[PDB]
A paper describes a structure:
One such adhesin, EtpA, is a 177 kDa or 1767 residues, secreted protein that bridges the tips of ETEC flagella to host epithelial glycans including human A blood group to promote bacterial adhesion, intestinal colonization and toxin delivery. EtpA is exported through a Gram-negative, two-partner secretion system (TPSS, type Vb) comprised of the secreted EtpA passenger (TpsA) protein and EtpB (TpsB) transporter that is integrated into the outer bacterial membrane. TpsA proteins share a conserved, N-terminal TPS domain followed by an extensive C-terminal domain with divergent sequence repeats. Outer membrane TspB proteins recognise the N-terminal TPS domain of their cognate TpsA to initiate exoprotein translocation across the outer membrane with simultaneous folding nucleated by the N-terminus.
The crystal structure of EtpA67-447 solved at 1.76 Å resolution revealed a right-handed parallel β-helix with two extra-helical hairpins and an N-terminal β-strand cap. The asymmetric unit of the EtpA67-447 crystals contained four symmetrically independent but equivalent monomers. Each monomer forms a triangular, right-handed β-helix of 13 turns (or rungs), where each turn consists of two or, more commonly, three roughly coplanar β-strands. Strands from adjacent turns align to create the parallel β-sheets PB1, PB2 and PB3 with 13, 11 and 14 β-strands, respectively. While β-strands β1 and β2 (red) form part of PB1 and PB2, they align antiparallel to the otherwise parallel β-sheets and serve to cap the β-helix. The loop connecting β-strands β9 and β10 is a type 1 β-turn and harbours a conserved NPNG motif critical for TpsA protein folding. The interior of the β-helix is dominated by hydrophobic, aliphatic residues, especially valine. Two loops connecting physically adjoining β-strands β12-β14 and β19-β22, are extended to create an extra helical domain consisting of α-helix α1 and β-strands β13, and β20 and β21, respectively. The extra-β-helical secondary structure elements all pack onto the outer face of β-sheet PB1 broadly alligned (anti-) parallel to its β-strands. Despite low sequence identities of EtpA67-447 with the other TPS domains (34% for HMW1-PP, 35% for HxuA, 27% for FHA30, and 23% for HpmA265), the domains all form analogous right-handed β-helices with tightly packed, hydrophobic cores and characteristic aromatic clusters in the first helical turn (W34, F47, F79, F88 and F99 in EtpA).
Residue numbers in the entry: -3 to 380
Write the structure that this text describes.
């Protein structure tokens, strides 16, 4: 645990490093893509690391080749984009602030040549027990992205990617395709033992998208994806989903917090919750309401499990006191809410799909299973 990154050297691209003076380290970048290796990459409280980059779409890769888990307690700022790779993991402290146009923290490595060719695929080299934990504040400029990729990813603080994307991913491999400085798409493949993505804090991608994906192996009923806080992607409805949870083909996806994709001045967003076993616990709240129309919430599959782009669950359990709301609030039709499984759907919660107060028809709700169905909750899908 040091106060500032040390042992830095530019090994690809063109740039310069200045050690701390006045509690701030300055890293200047000349090329569009730059690689710096670091003995360590810690930032103490009250200290800043400032990247001065040629373009908001420039990328600096920072690889820790020393031994310690990165301790980021102070500030990291950049006008462009920053990748931080540490096989031993990263902790962002309660006071930490990271503010960039796009930020990746990964325990999986990337090859220098791939990165300098703008082929952003990360895999291999992680140490056993390495996690990425955020207890501070990670934020990007509008349209940027934040990607945290490790065997275990935990957010108890705040992540904000307005008009952009947040991706928390526990997988063996992750590939980022960037388009004009924005995150165009993400592919995650390969299972990881004890894979875990947990959000006790706040993830907010206003007018953006949040994607949480954990791929474990042989969990039985160990949790792979746990959201006890708030995931919010209010704004324009997106066909590919405003909030997408994917627990893979093993383990439990547990929601006790809130997934929020509302749109007071339009149609509600789309929330997709996938996994093998999904538990919507008491107090959980999935809301995709819209002033001009309700949104779509799919838990365990699409309508009757016939959406190839949504994984079909084996079991879905919605506890009493859990709620889903796809209502239209002002004018327009209620949205669509689906609980689906292949083997067992136990519905004890509340699903709302009302039409607008000033007009509109009730929405469409399905609580079903290819196998066993226990439907004991409440569904309100009526006009006002």
């Amino acid at each position: 645990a040091s106060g500032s990154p040390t042992g830095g050297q530019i090994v690809a691209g063109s740039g310069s490093i200045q050690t701390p003076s006045g509690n701030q380290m300055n890293i200047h970048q000349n090329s569009q893509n730059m690689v710096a290796n670091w003995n360590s990459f810690d930032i103490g409280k009250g200290n800043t690391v400032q990247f001065d980059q040629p373009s908001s779409s420039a990328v600096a890769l920072n690889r820790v080749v020393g031994g310690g888990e990165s301790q980021i307690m102070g500030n990291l700022k950049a006008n462009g984009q920053v990748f931080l790779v540490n096989p031993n993991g990263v902790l962002f402290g309660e006071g930490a602030s990271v503010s960039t146009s796009g930020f990746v923290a990964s325990t999986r490595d990337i090859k220098n040549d791939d990165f300098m060719n703008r082929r952003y695929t990360f895999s291999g080299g992680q140490k056993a027990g390495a996690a990425i934990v955020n207890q501070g504040e990670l934020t990007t400029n509008a349209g940027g992205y934040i990607v945290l990729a490790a065997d275990r990813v935990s957010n108890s603080g705040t992540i904000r990617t307005p008009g952009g994307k947040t991706v928390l991913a526990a997988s063996e491999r992750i590939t980022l395709q960037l388009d004009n400085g924005g995150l165009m798409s993400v592919q995650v493949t390969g299972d990881v033992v004890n894979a875990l993505v947990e959000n006790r804090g706040l993830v907010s991608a206003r007018d953006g998208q949040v994607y949480l994906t954990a791929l474990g192996r042989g969990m039985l009923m160990n949790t792979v994806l746990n959201v006890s806080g708030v995931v919010e992607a209010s704004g324009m409805h997106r066909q590919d989903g405003n909030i997408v949870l994917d627990g893979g083909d093993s383990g439990v996806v547990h929601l006790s917090g809130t997934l929020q994709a509302d749109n007071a001045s339009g149609q509600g967003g789309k929330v997709v919750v996938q996994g093998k076993n999904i538990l919507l616990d008491k107090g959980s709240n999935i809301t995709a309401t819209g002033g001009q129309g309700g949104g779509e919430v799919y838990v365990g599959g699409g309508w009757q499990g016939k959406d190839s782009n949504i994984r079909n669950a084996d079991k879905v359990v919605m506890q009493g006191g859990a709620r889903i709301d796809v209502s239209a609030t002002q004018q327009g039709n209620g949205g669509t809410a689906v609980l689906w499984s292949d083997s067992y759907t136990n519905f004890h919660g509340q699903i709302g799909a009302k039409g607008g107060e000033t007009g509109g028809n009730g929405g469409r709700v399905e609580t079903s299973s290819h196998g066993n169905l226990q439907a004991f909750g409440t569904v309100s899908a009526s006009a006002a």
